[PDB]
């Protein structure tokens, strides 16, 4: 990997610059940034895994796993995919989750 | 086994190949977990999940499968030596 598993990245830019798809640990702030950049890039968000950052260490919680399979005609639905993804992250924050891993269709 | 688009996309980024998953599962159950996902976690149908799950593999290198649907619900990141196993996993049973 081009990034460190021992680091909780706080900027969405790191996700793209360091190729963190489906693997990089993101702070809540960074997770939202990645979702917004995904939309701007025309990328569908397939899933978001929520968990806790243990300073250091990521512990995934399967009950926080959000999944949205991409339909055939998906481009016009990206805005909704984005909205639901961000709503999901905000709901996880309300539930005490402190880190996320995002999977985009790339 | 059922592998959705999300898991398929995660596989190459988490060190798993189609064969790795199949082999790990064929080796037999090594633990149990549960697939509890609220309706909002499963767009666009929003059915959610409330099913027992089985774990295959070992710490840091495991796959979780929904007992009812056959869906792979989680795959560990084998590229992360510090991956902390999901708290719901109970090894042995």
The residue ranges of every structural domain in chain B are 1-93
Total structural domains in chain A? 1
C-alpha to C-alpha distance for B7 and B11, rounded to whole angstroms = 6
Chain A hits for B85, Cβ within 8 Å = 59
Question: Looking only at Cα atoms, what is the longest distance across chain B?
Answer: 35
Q: Which domain holds residue A45?
A: 1-106
* CATH fold label, B1-93: YaeB-like fold (3.30.2310)
Q: Which of B37, B77, B87 sits opposite A23 (nearest CB)?
A: B77
C-alpha to C-alpha distance for A66 and A45, rounded to whole angstroms = 10
Chain B hits for A96, Cβ within 8 Å = none
Domain holding A62: CATH number? 3.30.190.30
Alpha helices in B1-93 (DSSP H): 5-10, 18-26
Interface touch B40/A62, C-beta < 8 Å? no
3-state secondary structure of A16: helix
Closest residue, chain A, to B11 (C-alpha): A22
Classify residue A18 by burial, with Cβ atoms within 10 Å: 0-12, 13-18, 19+: middle
In what helix (H) or strand (E) does residue A86 lie, and over which residues does it extend? helix A78-94
3-state secondary structure of B59: coil
C-alpha to C-alpha distance for B74 and A67, rounded to whole angstroms = 11
Residue entry with tokens 């991956």: B83
**Which residues in A have their CB inside 8 Å of a CB on B?**
1, 5-6, 21-23, 46-47, 49, 54, 56-71, 84, 87-88, 91, 101, 103-106
Name, in order, each residue with C-beta under 8 angstroms of A32's C-beta and a sequence gap of 6 or more. Answer: A12, A86, A89
Strands B61-66 and A99-104: unpaired
| Cross-strand partners of B90 | B32
CB B72 within 8 A of CB B64: yes
Technique used to solve these coordinates: X-ray
The residue among A39, A103, A105 whose CA lies nearest residue A71 is A105
Question: Looking only at Cα atoms, what is the longest distance across chain A?
Answer: 41
Q: Which of B10, B35, B38 sits opposite A22 (nearest CB)?
A: B10
3-state secondary structure of A55: coil
Tally of residues, chain A: 106
CB B14 within 8 A of CB B77: yes
């Amino acid at each position: 990997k081009l990034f460190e598993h021992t680091v909780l990245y706080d900027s969405g830019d790191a996700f793209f610059e360091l190729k963190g798809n489906a693997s990089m640990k993101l702070s809540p702030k960074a997770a939202i940034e990645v979702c917004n950049e995904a939309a701007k890039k025309g990328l569908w968000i397939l899933g978001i895994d929520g968990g806790h950052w243990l300073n250091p260490g990521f512990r995934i919680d399967s009950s926080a796993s959000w999944t949205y399979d991409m339909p055939e005609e998906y481009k016009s639905k990206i805005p909704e995919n984005n909205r639901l993804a961000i709503e999901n992250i905000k709901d996880d924050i309300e539930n005490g989750y402190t880190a996320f891993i995002i999977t985009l269709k790339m | 086994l059922k592998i959705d688009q999300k898991i398929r996309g995660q596989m190459p980024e988490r060190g798993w190949t189609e064969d790795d998953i199949k082999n790990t599962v064929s080796n037999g159950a090594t633990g149990t977990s549960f697939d509890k996902r609220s309706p909002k976690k499963t767009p666009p149908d929003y059915l959610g999940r409330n099913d027992p799950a089985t774990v295959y593999g070992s710490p840091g290198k495991y796959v979780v499968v929904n007992d009812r649907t056959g869906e792979v619900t989680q795959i560990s990141d084998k590229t992360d030596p510090g991956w902390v196993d999901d708290s719901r996993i109970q090894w042995g049973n």
